[PDB]
Design a protein around this motif. Structure first.
Motif, PDB file in Angstrom:
ATOM      1  N   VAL A 277      29.810  -4.729  -2.110  1.00 25.37           N
ATOM      2  CA  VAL A 277      29.644  -3.574  -1.198  1.00 25.37           C
ATOM      3  C   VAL A 277      28.273  -2.896  -1.336  1.00 25.37           C
ATOM      4  CG1 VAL A 277      30.634  -1.291  -0.562  1.00 25.37           C
ATOM      5  CG2 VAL A 277      32.177  -3.144  -1.225  1.00 25.37           C
TER       6      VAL A 277
ATOM      7  N   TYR B  68      28.833   2.062   2.241  1.00 28.18           N
ATOM      8  CA  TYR B  68      30.186   2.352   2.716  1.00 28.18           C
ATOM      9  C   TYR B  68      30.265   3.720   3.343  1.00 28.18           C
ATOM     10  CZ  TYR B  68      30.542   5.057  -1.651  1.00 28.18           C
ATOM     11  OH  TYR B  68      30.285   5.920  -2.657  1.00 28.18           O
TER      12      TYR B  68
ATOM     13  N   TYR C  80      30.862   5.195  -7.039  1.00 34.17           N
ATOM     14  CA  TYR C  80      31.240   3.956  -7.721  1.00 34.17           C
ATOM     15  C   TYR C  80      30.610   2.745  -7.061  1.00 34.17           C
ATOM     16  CZ  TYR C  80      34.990   6.729 -10.037  1.00 34.17           C
ATOM     17  OH  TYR C  80      35.731   7.668 -10.769  1.00 34.17           O
TER      18      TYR C  80
ATOM     19  N   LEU D 258      34.352  -7.744  -4.110  1.00 30.36           N
ATOM     20  CA  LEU D 258      35.605  -8.424  -3.934  1.00 30.36           C
ATOM     21  C   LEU D 258      35.377  -9.916  -3.786  1.00 30.36           C
ATOM     22  CD1 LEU D 258      35.995  -9.292  -0.690  1.00 30.36           C
ATOM     23  CD2 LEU D 258      36.106  -6.752  -0.513  1.00 30.36           C
TER      24      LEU D 258
ATOM     25  N   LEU E 175      39.861  -7.573  -6.208  1.00 29.31           N
ATOM     26  CA  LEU E 175      38.953  -6.444  -6.075  1.00 29.31           C
ATOM     27  C   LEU E 175      38.456  -5.919  -7.415  1.00 29.31           C
ATOM     28  CD1 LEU E 175      41.230  -4.129  -3.802  1.00 29.31           C
ATOM     29  CD2 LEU E 175      39.461  -5.893  -2.958  1.00 29.31           C
TER      30      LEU E 175
ATOM     31  N   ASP F 115      42.067  -5.311  -8.895  1.00 23.62           N
ATOM     32  CA  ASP F 115      43.330  -5.530  -8.219  1.00 23.62           C
ATOM     33  C   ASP F 115      43.345  -6.958  -7.708  1.00 23.62           C
ATOM     34  OD1 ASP F 115      44.882  -2.728  -7.429  1.00 23.62           O
ATOM     35  OD2 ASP F 115      42.704  -2.457  -7.726  1.00 23.62           O
TER      36      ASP F 115
ATOM     37  N   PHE G 282      49.033  -4.956  -3.119  1.00 20.28           N
ATOM     38  CA  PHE G 282      48.115  -5.165  -4.250  1.00 20.28           C
ATOM     39  C   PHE G 282      48.800  -4.856  -5.561  1.00 20.28           C
ATOM     40  CE2 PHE G 282      47.523  -0.908  -2.376  1.00 20.28           C
ATOM     41  CZ  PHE G 282      47.643  -0.027  -3.459  1.00 20.28           C
TER      42      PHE G 282
ATOM     43  N   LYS H 241      47.582  -3.819  -9.587  1.00 18.87           N
ATOM     44  CA  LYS H 241      46.459  -3.446 -10.418  1.00 18.87           C
ATOM     45  C   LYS H 241      46.563  -4.251 -11.697  1.00 18.87           C
ATOM     46  CE  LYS H 241      44.119   0.662 -12.046  1.00 18.87           C
ATOM     47  NZ  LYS H 241      44.398   2.030 -12.604  1.00 18.87           N
TER      48      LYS H 241
ATOM     49  N   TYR I  81      47.199  -2.407   1.444  1.00 19.29           N
ATOM     50  CA  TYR I  81      46.087  -2.080   2.375  1.00 19.29           C
ATOM     51  C   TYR I  81      46.029  -3.071   3.526  1.00 19.29           C
ATOM     52  CZ  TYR I  81      43.163  -5.586  -0.233  1.00 19.29           C
ATOM     53  OH  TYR I  81      42.702  -6.667  -0.914  1.00 19.29           O
TER      54      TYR I  81
ATOM     55  N   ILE J  48      33.534  -4.497   7.273  1.00 16.62           N
ATOM     56  CA  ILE J  48      34.995  -4.473   7.228  1.00 16.62           C
ATOM     57  C   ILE J  48      35.524  -3.029   7.327  1.00 16.62           C
ATOM     58  CG2 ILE J  48      35.033  -6.806   6.023  1.00 16.62           C
ATOM     59  CD1 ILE J  48      36.282  -5.278   3.587  1.00 16.62           C
TER      60      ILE J  48
ATOM     61  N   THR K 287      38.975  -0.783   6.186  1.00 23.20           N
ATOM     62  CA  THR K 287      40.203  -0.854   5.359  1.00 23.20           C
ATOM     63  C   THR K 287      40.985   0.423   5.473  1.00 23.20           C
ATOM     64  OG1 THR K 287      39.093  -2.167   3.664  1.00 23.20           O
ATOM     65  CG2 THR K 287      41.221  -1.267   3.109  1.00 23.20           C
TER      66      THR K 287
ATOM     67  N   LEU L 230      43.967   2.200   3.219  1.00 21.83           N
ATOM     68  CA  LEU L 230      44.685   2.113   1.947  1.00 21.83           C
ATOM     69  C   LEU L 230      45.959   3.014   2.015  1.00 21.83           C
ATOM     70  CD1 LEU L 230      45.109   1.350  -1.003  1.00 21.83           C
ATOM     71  CD2 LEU L 230      43.480   3.235  -1.652  1.00 21.83           C
TER      72      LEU L 230
ATOM     73  N   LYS M 230      49.480   4.134  -0.356  1.00 20.37           N
ATOM     74  CA  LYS M 230      50.181   4.147  -1.647  1.00 20.37           C
ATOM     75  C   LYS M 230      51.501   4.918  -1.473  1.00 20.37           C
ATOM     76  CE  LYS M 230      47.467   3.477  -5.523  1.00 20.37           C
ATOM     77  NZ  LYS M 230      46.887   4.155  -6.711  1.00 20.37           N
TER      78      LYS M 230
HETATM   79  C1  HEM Z   1      36.271  -3.564   0.392  1.00 25.88           C
HETATM   80  C2  HEM Z   1      37.040  -2.678   1.000  1.00 25.88           C
HETATM   81  C3  HEM Z   1      37.962  -1.956   0.014  1.00 25.88           C
HETATM   82  C4  HEM Z   1      39.213  -2.311  -0.230  1.00 25.88           C
HETATM   83  C5  HEM Z   1      39.947  -3.482   0.415  1.00 25.88           C
HETATM   84  C6  HEM Z   1      39.753  -1.404  -1.201  1.00 25.88           C
HETATM   85  C7  HEM Z   1      41.014  -1.412  -1.754  1.00 25.88           C
HETATM   86  C8  HEM Z   1      41.458  -0.472  -2.663  1.00 25.88           C
HETATM   87  C9  HEM Z   1      42.774  -0.461  -3.282  1.00 25.88           C
HETATM   88  C10 HEM Z   1      43.772  -1.589  -3.049  1.00 25.88           C
HETATM   89  C11 HEM Z   1      42.890   0.608  -4.062  1.00 25.88           C
HETATM   90  C12 HEM Z   1      44.100   0.993  -4.954  1.00 25.88           C
HETATM   91  C13 HEM Z   1      43.772   0.609  -6.414  1.00 25.88           C
HETATM   92  C14 HEM Z   1      45.022   0.655  -7.302  1.00 25.88           C
HETATM   93  O1  HEM Z   1      45.490   1.810  -7.453  1.00 25.88           O
HETATM   94  O2  HEM Z   1      45.542  -0.380  -7.850  1.00 25.88           O
HETATM   95  C15 HEM Z   1      41.644   1.344  -3.946  1.00 25.88           C
HETATM   96  C16 HEM Z   1      41.350   2.524  -4.588  1.00 25.88           C
HETATM   97  C17 HEM Z   1      40.122   3.053  -4.786  1.00 25.88           C
HETATM   98  N1  HEM Z   1      38.916   2.563  -4.248  1.00 25.88           N
HETATM   99 FE1  HEM Z   1      38.800   1.054  -2.861  1.00 25.88          FE
HETATM  100  N2  HEM Z   1      38.749  -0.498  -1.547  1.00 25.88           N
HETATM  101  C18 HEM Z   1      37.626  -0.820  -0.804  1.00 25.88           C
HETATM  102  C19 HEM Z   1      36.401  -0.151  -0.834  1.00 25.88           C
HETATM  103  C20 HEM Z   1      36.051   0.791  -1.745  1.00 25.88           C
HETATM  104  C21 HEM Z   1      34.698   1.284  -1.978  1.00 25.88           C
HETATM  105  C22 HEM Z   1      33.450   0.843  -1.174  1.00 25.88           C
HETATM  106  C23 HEM Z   1      34.728   2.188  -2.969  1.00 25.88           C
HETATM  107  C24 HEM Z   1      33.589   3.011  -3.641  1.00 25.88           C
HETATM  108  C25 HEM Z   1      32.346   2.544  -3.686  1.00 25.88           C
HETATM  109  C26 HEM Z   1      36.096   2.290  -3.403  1.00 25.88           C
HETATM  110  C27 HEM Z   1      36.509   3.126  -4.402  1.00 25.88           C
HETATM  111  C28 HEM Z   1      37.838   3.337  -4.726  1.00 25.88           C
HETATM  112  C29 HEM Z   1      38.328   4.401  -5.585  1.00 25.88           C
HETATM  113  C30 HEM Z   1      37.529   5.496  -6.324  1.00 25.88           C
HETATM  114  C31 HEM Z   1      39.844   4.197  -5.646  1.00 25.88           C
HETATM  115  C32 HEM Z   1      40.830   5.049  -6.482  1.00 25.88           C
HETATM  116  C33 HEM Z   1      41.771   5.944  -5.685  1.00 25.88           C
HETATM  117  C34 HEM Z   1      42.684   6.605  -6.727  1.00 25.88           C
HETATM  118  O3  HEM Z   1      42.828   6.054  -7.898  1.00 25.88           O
HETATM  119  O4  HEM Z   1      43.261   7.689  -6.385  1.00 25.88           O
HETATM  120  N3  HEM Z   1      36.888   1.421  -2.650  1.00 25.88           N
HETATM  121  N4  HEM Z   1      40.826   0.681  -3.083  1.00 25.88           N
END
Ligand code: HEM
Length: 185
Positions: free
Chosen positions: A26, A29, A41, A45, A58, A71, A87, A89, A106, A120, A122, A124, A126
């Motif tokens: 990435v 975003y 962050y 992927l 991921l 994930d 997904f 973790k 997601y 892309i 997305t 999300l 939960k």
């Molecule tokens: C590629 C597209 C993305 C997909 C498919 C995706 C998917 C996900 C998924 C599945 C989770 C849940 C994780 C878990 O609890 O097991 C998540 C959470 C999270 N993602 Fe992404 N993500 C994407 C892009 C991003 C980007 C670009 C960032 C930051 C640069 C990001 C930062 C985070 C953060 C900080 C969480 C934590 C939310 C929480 O714990 O409350 N994600 N994402």
């Protein structure tokens, strides 16, 4: 909140080139539901196939604390370029931290892709609630700036590239070996 619903999948999307098992980083975003807490962050992927299933792993890295989380999902094609993923973790070795569960999923749409880049969207979810809502510019090389074709796709999606956050100066570190090996787990 409510996730954006209307994303169009790339016309003539090539799933073989996208799901080739290699890493997408990435670079930029646009998160439409940012936390109140300032967070910057890094993410990457890898999407491919393992034992006959479409799989996506991921990786997220926090440069301020060195924390990482991973994930892995089996993907189900909803229509050309649109996917759902339940997904779980995991540790980098595949050990399960949080099981697959019903309302943890997601969906994503490949809006643009070529050999080197992609856009892309997305959504999300939960425990049956829309959490994050997010567009990501991807590239096959972590040091590459968004090219004209992908910026073109950003425009075509009625988005403003200047709204995106760049990961380029974020002191990102990646764990490609684990991402790739997670595909089989
Ligand atoms: C590629 C597209 C993305 C997909 C498919 C995706 C998917 C996900 C998924 C599945 C989770 C849940 C994780 C878990 O609890 O097991 C998540 C959470 C999270 N993602 Fe992404 N993500 C994407 C892009 C991003 C980007 C670009 C960032 C930051 C640069 C990001 C930062 C985070 C953060 C900080 C969480 C934590 C939310 C929480 O714990 O409350 N994600 N994402």
């Amino acid at each position: 909140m409510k996730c954006t619903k209307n994303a169009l999948a790339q016309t003539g999307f090539n799933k073989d080139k996208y799901f080739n098992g290699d890493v997408w980083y990435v670079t930029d975003y646009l998160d439409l539901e940012p936390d109140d807490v300032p967070k910057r962050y890094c993410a990457a992927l890898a999407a491919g196939t393992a034992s006959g299933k479409l799989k996506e792993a991921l990786y997220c890295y926090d440069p301020k604390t060195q924390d990482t989380f991973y994930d892995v999902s089996e993907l189900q094609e909803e229509s050309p370029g649109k996917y759902t993923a339940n997904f779980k973790k995991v540790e980098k070795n595949g050990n399960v931290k949080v099981d697959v569960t019903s309302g943890n999923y997601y969906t994503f749409t490949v809006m643009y892709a070529d050999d080197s880049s992609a856009l892309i969207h997305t959504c999300l979810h939960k425990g049956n609630k829309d959490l994050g809502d997010l567009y990501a510019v991807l590239n096959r090389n972590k040091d590459t700036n968004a090219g004209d074709k992908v910026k073109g796709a950003v425009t075509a999606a009625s988005l403003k590239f200047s709204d995106f956050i760049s990961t380029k100066d974020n002191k990102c570190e990646y764990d490609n070996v684990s991402l790739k090996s997670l595909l089989t787990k």
